[PDB]
From a paper:
The PfEMP1 family of surface proteins is central for Plasmodium falciparum virulence and must retain the ability to bind to host receptors while also diversifying to aid immune evasion. The interaction between CIDRα1 domains of PfEMP1 and endothelial protein C receptor (EPCR) is associated with severe childhood malaria. We combine crystal structures of CIDRα1:EPCR complexes with analysis of 885 CIDRα1 sequences, showing that the EPCR-binding surfaces of CIDRα1 domains are conserved in shape and bonding potential, despite dramatic sequence diversity. Additionally, these domains mimic features of the natural EPCR ligand and can block this ligand interaction.
Crystals of the HB3var03 CIDRα1.4:EPCR complex formed and diffracted to 2.65Å resolution. The structure was consistent with an envelope obtained from solution small-angle X-ray scattering, and the two copies of HB3var03 CIDRα1 in the asymmetric unit aligned with a root-mean-square deviation (rmsd) of just 0.09Å, showing them to be extremely similar. The HB3var03 CIDRα1:EPCR interface has a surface area of 978Å2 and surrounds the kinked helix. At its center is a small hydrophobic patch containing F656 and F655, which interact with a hydrophobic patch on EPCR. In particular, F656 is positioned at the bend in the kinked α helix, where it protrudes from the domain surface, allowing it to insert into the hydrophobic groove of EPCR. This patch lies within a larger surface that is complementary in shape to EPCR and contains a series of amino acids (D576, K642, D652, S653, Q657, Y660, and K661) that make hydrogen bonds to EPCR side chains. However, the F656A mutation, which removes the majority of this interaction, had a 35-fold effect on the affinity and significantly increased the off rate, with a 100-fold change in the dissociation rate constant. Therefore, the insertion of F656 into the hydrophobic groove of EPCR increases the lifetime of the complex. In particular, F4 binds to the same site as F656 from HB3var03 CIDRα1. The CIDRα1-binding site is larger than that of protein C, extending to make contacts with two additional EPCR loops (residues 22–25 and 44–47) through K642 of the HB3var03 CIDRα1 domain.
Author numbering:
A (entry chain C): 503 to 528, 536 to 557, 565 to 597, 605 to 684, 692 to 716
B (entry chain D): 9 to 176
Write the structure that this text describes.
């Protein structure tokens, strides 16, 4: 089992910085997940209207929101690549680190390389197919932002060295924050 | 003559699906598809396509299954679906003997009842049910919103499917 403190942005219209305002200047979700190999009863618990979901429901939400927020952050940070633009940059870097912690806590449910189910460790092609409709829904020109993201993950894997899309995605977002931080000097 | 394709998708919940399908050229059975969402086996019973070409076809079908499941998950997350649930997709291309334009179709049924179907003329999906619902409206909005579910789908039916029939 594990404890995952999730920083969940909204599901409504607004600037990502404004949506995550209290996180940037510091109230989001404490989860508790349980996992077993042959047991199908794998459930997650939301503490503090508190909910009980299946692991698959929680994991789908987590991946879907990671992908939606990445696109939202990237479009906000591309617009300024200004005072809030440096503040947006600092909150994004803080957010990447928060998402890396969330991911490592989720990974504690496994503790095996070959034994991490294909279902939760998809490659770029699979991930981009699986979450096409879910992520695309949110955005105006969603189809194009999704293709842009896939090509950029494909560039990341080509520059580094088949392997998990989430790790390639973390590399892409860590790079955006690096470019972002370096630019805030001038 | 024709290529028909049938896909039955048994959803125990939004996250788990068992696929069972097949395809036929003319009168007889040429392909079989079976397995859970993560490990679906796709086979050509006869060596119609050479190894490289078959691998490409399998890749396209596997991408389709992931996207299909993704759409079902989205409809549930946005509008709520009642599970367990079965979806049937029946699609294909038929080449008239006279020589006119191929007749193409893609019909979707849910729990044995007509739901939505593709209209290739303008590459748009329509409701086949007379029961209006948020679910039907939402599903159609999604299907009619993207190049993938409209134009690429029409090209699969009018071009890929037709060329496959002409070849074998
Ligand atoms: C030359 C070789 C070709 C011949 C192949 C023969 C092999 C037969 C295999 C045997 C098994 C038969 C059953 C499987 C049928 C699948 C049909 C494939 C369709 C497909 O791949 O369409 C692609 C688009 O995908 C999409 O459109 C995905 C979107 C999902 C839409 C789902 C439909 C509606 C469901 C509604 C559910 C909602 C739930 C609410 C209750 C077209 O693209 P492409 O292959 O041309 O490549 C373009 C490269 N970019
Ligand atoms: C597609 O068909 C499915 C069965 O063929 C159907 O599932 C059935 O749904 C009912 C209602 O949700 C379940 O009944 C249970 O829930 C009600 C809730 O009010 C209770 O009162 C009952 O006592 C019962 O516990 C059935 O159990 C379920 N069938 C099976 C075999 O699991 C789907 O709802 C259908 N889906 C669509 C979209 O039409
Ligand atoms: C794919 O699925 C099944 C495999 O047997 C076939 O469905 C049967 O079709 C015949 C008529 O052709 C009916 O008498 C049976 O009742 C059907 N089965 C069921 C369970 O309803 C189907 O023909 C196969 N092939 C194609 C191209 O769909
Ligand atoms: C993944 O690959 C195939 C399914 O795609 C699995 O093999 C299947 O085994 C069951 C039960 O014996 C059969 O109903 C299938 O038709 C078999 N498929 C093939 C291709 O032979 C295989 O066991 C799966 N492995 C894992 C670890 O998930
Ligand atoms: C969709 O296809 C048409 C061609 O029919 C094209 O003009 C358009 O740019 C395509 N791309 C997207 C993402 O809409």
């Amino acid at each position: 089992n594990t404890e995952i403190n999730v920083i969940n942005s909204g599901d409504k219209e607004g600037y990502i910085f404004e949506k995550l305002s209290e996180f940037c200047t510091n109230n989001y979700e404490q989860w508790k997940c349980y996992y077993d190999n042959k047991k199908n009863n794998n459930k997650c618990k939301m503490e503090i209207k508190n909910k009980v979901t299946s692991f698959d429901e929680f994991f789908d939400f987590w991946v879907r929101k990671l992908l939606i927020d990445t696109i939202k952050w990237e479009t906000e940070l591309t617009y300024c690549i200004c005072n809030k633009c440096n503040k947006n940059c600092v909150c994004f870097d803080k957010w990447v680190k928060q998402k890396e912690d969330e991911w490592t806590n989720i990974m504690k449910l496994f503790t095996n390389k070959h034994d991490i189910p294909k279902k939760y460790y998809l490659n770029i092609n699979d991930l981009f197919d699986s979450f096409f409709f879910q992520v695309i829904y949110k955005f105006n020109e969603g189809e194009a932002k999704w293709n842009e993201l896939k090509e950029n993950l494909k560039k990341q894997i080509a520059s580094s060295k088949s392997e998990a899309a989430i790790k390639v995605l973390f590399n892409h977002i860590k790079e955006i924050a690096t470019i972002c931080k370096d630019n805030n000097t001038n | 003559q024709r290529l028909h394709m049938l896909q039955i998708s048994y959803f125990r919940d939004p996250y788990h699906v068992w696929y069972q399908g097949n395809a036929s050229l003319g009168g007889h059975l040429t392909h079989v598809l079976e397995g859970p969402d993560t490990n679906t086996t796709i086979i050509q019973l006869q060596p119609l396509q050479e190894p490289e070409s078959w691998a490409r076809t399998q890749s396209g079908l596997q991408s389709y299954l992931l996207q299909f499941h993704g759409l079902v998950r989205l409809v549930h997350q946005e509008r709520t679906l009642a599970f367990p649930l079965t979806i049937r997709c029946f699609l294909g291309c038929e080449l008239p003997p006279e020589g006119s334009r191929a007749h193409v179709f893609f019909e979707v049924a849910v729990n044995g009842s007509s739901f939505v179907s593709f209209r290739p003329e303008r590459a748009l999906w329509q409701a086949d049910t007379q029961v209006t619902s948020g679910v039907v409206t939402f599903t159609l909005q999604q299907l009619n919103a993207y190049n993938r579910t409209r134009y690429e789908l029409r090209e699969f039916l009018e071009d890929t499917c037709v060329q496959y029939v002409q070849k074998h």
